[PDB]
Design a protein around this nucleic acid. Sequence first.
RNA 1: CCUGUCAAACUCCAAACUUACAGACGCCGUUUGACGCGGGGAUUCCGGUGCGCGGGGUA
RNA 2: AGUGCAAGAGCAAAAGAUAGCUUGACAGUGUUCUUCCCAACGAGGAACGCUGACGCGAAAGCGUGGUCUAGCGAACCAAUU
RNA 3: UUAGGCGGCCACAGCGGUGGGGUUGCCUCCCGUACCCAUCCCGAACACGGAAGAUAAGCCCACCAGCGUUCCGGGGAGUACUGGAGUGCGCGAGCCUCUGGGAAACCCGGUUCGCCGCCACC
Lengths: 140, 160, 186, 95, 154
Amino acid sequence: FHEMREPRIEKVVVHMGIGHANAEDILGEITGQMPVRTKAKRTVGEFDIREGDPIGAKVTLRDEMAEEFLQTALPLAELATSQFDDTGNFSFGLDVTVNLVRPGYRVAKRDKASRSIPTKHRLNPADAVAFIESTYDVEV
Amino acid sequence: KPASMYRDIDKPAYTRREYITGIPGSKIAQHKMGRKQKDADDYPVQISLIVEETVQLRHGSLEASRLSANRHLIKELGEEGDYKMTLRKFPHQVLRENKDGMRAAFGKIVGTAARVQAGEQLFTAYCNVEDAEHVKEAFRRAYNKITPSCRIDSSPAGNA
Amino acid sequence: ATGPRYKVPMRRRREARTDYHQRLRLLKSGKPRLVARKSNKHVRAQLVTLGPNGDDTLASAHSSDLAEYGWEAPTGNMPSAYLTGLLAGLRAQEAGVEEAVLDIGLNSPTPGSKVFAIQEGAIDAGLDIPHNDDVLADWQRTRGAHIAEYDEQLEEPLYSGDFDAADLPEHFDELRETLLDGDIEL
Amino acid sequence: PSSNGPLEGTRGKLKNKPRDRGTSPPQRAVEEFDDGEKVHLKIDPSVPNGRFHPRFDGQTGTVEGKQGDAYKVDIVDGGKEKTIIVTAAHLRRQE
Amino acid sequence: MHALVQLRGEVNMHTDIQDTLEMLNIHHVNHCTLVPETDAYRGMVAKVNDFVAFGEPSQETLETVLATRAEPLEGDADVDDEWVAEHTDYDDISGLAFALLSEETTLREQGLSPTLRLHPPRGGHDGVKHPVKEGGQLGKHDTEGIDDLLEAMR
RNA sequence: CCUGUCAAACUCCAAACUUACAGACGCCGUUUGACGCGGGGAUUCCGGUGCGCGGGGUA
RNA sequence: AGUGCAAGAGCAAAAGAUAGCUUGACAGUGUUCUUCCCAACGAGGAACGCUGACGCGAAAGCGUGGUCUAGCGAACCAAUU
RNA sequence: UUAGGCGGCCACAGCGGUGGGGUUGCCUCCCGUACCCAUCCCGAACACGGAAGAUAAGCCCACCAGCGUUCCGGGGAGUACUGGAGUGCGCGAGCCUCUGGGAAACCCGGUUCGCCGCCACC
Ligand SMILES: [Cl-]
Ligand SMILES: [Cl-]
Ligand SMILES: [Mg+2]
Ligand SMILES: [Mg+2]
Ligand SMILES: [Mg+2]
Ligand SMILES: [Mg+2]
Ligand SMILES: [Mg+2]
Ligand SMILES: [Mg+2]
Ligand SMILES: [Mg+2]
Ligand code: NA
Ligand code: NA
Ligand code: NA
Ligand code: NA
Ligand SMILES: [Sr+2]
Ligand SMILES: [Sr+2]
Ligand SMILES: [Sr+2]
Ligand SMILES: [Sr+2]
Ligand SMILES: [Sr+2]
Ligand SMILES: [Sr+2]
Ligand SMILES: [Sr+2]
């Protein structure tokens, strides 16, 4: 019961929302895998009338790539309570986002007969702070 | 202009403001009167003015009657008397006038009126057993300024 | 749910199992559908026809009932899929069915996949099914070669329950051998 | 009418009932009717093609063959006989 | 079985109401017809309700009226028990009367004209501007009321 | 929460009723031939009134 | 929400968005309806076929322009294929 | 159907909730990337290969009505409205009688936490 319920890291999404890029090279090093560009929508007075066009970049890490990143990334921050989601997520930092979830998350991400995860199986802030804190660092 | 011109319900309902423009503001100052911070259940007596015929009452008439009625309740119970009266209707019907013979006759917007079916309550007061005859007088003056004949019916009030 | 005016998807749409837009397009042919489906451990082919109260399955095969003819191997691989298609196909001929349209439900049209293997099998069984050769895996992969070589890079047997060490595409042949034959009780 | 196009005054008859909103079931779009069969004509708001002139909504004609997949239905508009090309999606068997 | 008598003329009568009367074989004022009580016929009389007088007559009365106003499908041949006996599935007017009331046959069925061309009401009727409940003569009647009328028009 | 009101260009509802097709009864047609079809000849395309439902207009 | 533009209507594993590919906004000839309810009338329009040649897709299939209803023009003459 | 596949009607099926269920069986989650295939970056997904673990999700089974919905009883209501008729009433806007139809809101009590078809299956 506890096994198929104990949390895990689904993805680590590191991105640098700039606004006009040359920053891809650093993320390519800090994470270990290829980054992707970030297009935008809606026109903006702030000389942002080009809907589709480079403005940022991101990397989504999973499994080892993810963990091996947090090992050196988490220490760089000072995690708190508010800094956590209502689903059990937390973003810090160049932004560093950690998406946590229980085992069978696939049920909501697969194509055939997908389904939305019941609130009971959804991770909790408290459950999140725990799991995480229970691995190389403090809370609030 | 004579009410004879609009008192009847002989035209389609004309209320959609999304297709009408230049509608004159209402002349009705208030619909809630007396001590409106207090409820209606807080009174022993509840009297209403009932219209006896289905009609259309222009806002200038609702204001005249409501005024000449509340003005009495004020003069008899004081600018803060323990009473409360309500004009429950609002003039939704927009009225015109063709003010050029019958050519392009559709009229220009000139006012608003409330439609009242016979037997309905136009006004309603809630007073203490004391001021019961003071409200009955306020309505007498009120029905003297609206087209139809009215009944001054006494709802909750078995102190006769 | 929210109110009187709320629109709730047809049951099978919310269960996320039927693509109606694709369905209608299939039905427009007037031919029976070779419904190819797959699970983690199994694969299944059905020849479905339209009916007054719901679809009508006129024949079908399942990877499970493959062993019933001499199969000791797993049932979630390519060799599995093809042979099942064929088994299902053969039975289809029995019931008088002659042509079909491939319905892969919510699976993707990936080149060389199993739903296509199921299709090549059903076609070899003798069913007239609109297809495209350069979208079917290469013969050897159907046999199960890709897995043998994967087992080549041994160190720890690929299969846990000893069906065999270096696995066998040669078995695929013995099983297809048995199906293309007459006798065989369908 | 202020204008005389085909969809003039078709506000109600071509608007879907809230819950009937959205893509319609394929079953009745694929239905097969026989020559001689009586069928009621009623356009399906959700289905764009295969419609007949709205004016004929409510008719109950007779399948007298088909053109492609669409059906040829015979009706009598007032006193005049007319043939109507309509797809199953917009037809229903009678009785 | 209800007796139907047209009491109001055709001038200004709705055409669909007039055609209905003719389908029930009445073509003139005062003419009377005998109609079975079926859902179909029911709708019909309900439609002609304001130009007619109807209701179930008594065996007796039906016998009086048949005797006095019944006619053959063709010819002036008088209709009496002897006629009835020699031309119908019955023995006399009574056997006929009973059969009609019980709805086993129809005048047309027994070679009799579907209509009884009655005579103006002796002493006049209660008026054609009001129904029975309002003191008039139009509409559904009492077996006793229908009898009073039919007899007055014998 | 409570409390006061509306819609020709609003509708979660919803008639009476109008209307397609069929069967039944009725009426009608097979010497008075209906229904339908072809052809000859028109007149007519200033209308009005009552009642019902209207739209415009103080009327 | 979006779907070029009035209004009403249609659309959510799409009729909307993005990406890629493509040129069916193609040739020939009809059926039907509409224009013109019933009920005759042209140009114009639409839906639905058959033949030809293609595009895309695994394939069913979709594409006779833009989700549907506005964006249209006789004879004579000229130019053109 | 001791958990499956394709469906029809398309909320009576939605929303939310409680309880129960799986050693070589089923569906899953799950394990894992040599291949077919895959990500504008990620075997996340898609695709493929597979069984160490698991019944916590999903799913299937049993059930609860607070919200939404279908239908029914009773009340609202034969009211509102209305097809046919009237030398009935009203200064009139309008009303009434007889005949044939007949709601909606809302309250109260029930019902509804899907029904059905084909196939496969200890
Ligand atoms: Cl599947
Ligand atoms: Cl048409
Ligand atoms: Mg309308
Ligand atoms: Mg004679
Ligand atoms: Mg008299
Ligand atoms: Mg000229
Ligand atoms: Mg030129
Ligand atoms: Mg459980
Ligand atoms: Mg009078
Ligand atoms: Na970019
Ligand atoms: Na629909
Ligand atoms: Na034309
Ligand atoms: Na579970
Ligand atoms: Sr008027
Ligand atoms: Sr007065
Ligand atoms: Sr009408
Ligand atoms: Sr189109
Ligand atoms: Sr994985
Ligand atoms: Sr007067
Ligand atoms: Sr009734």
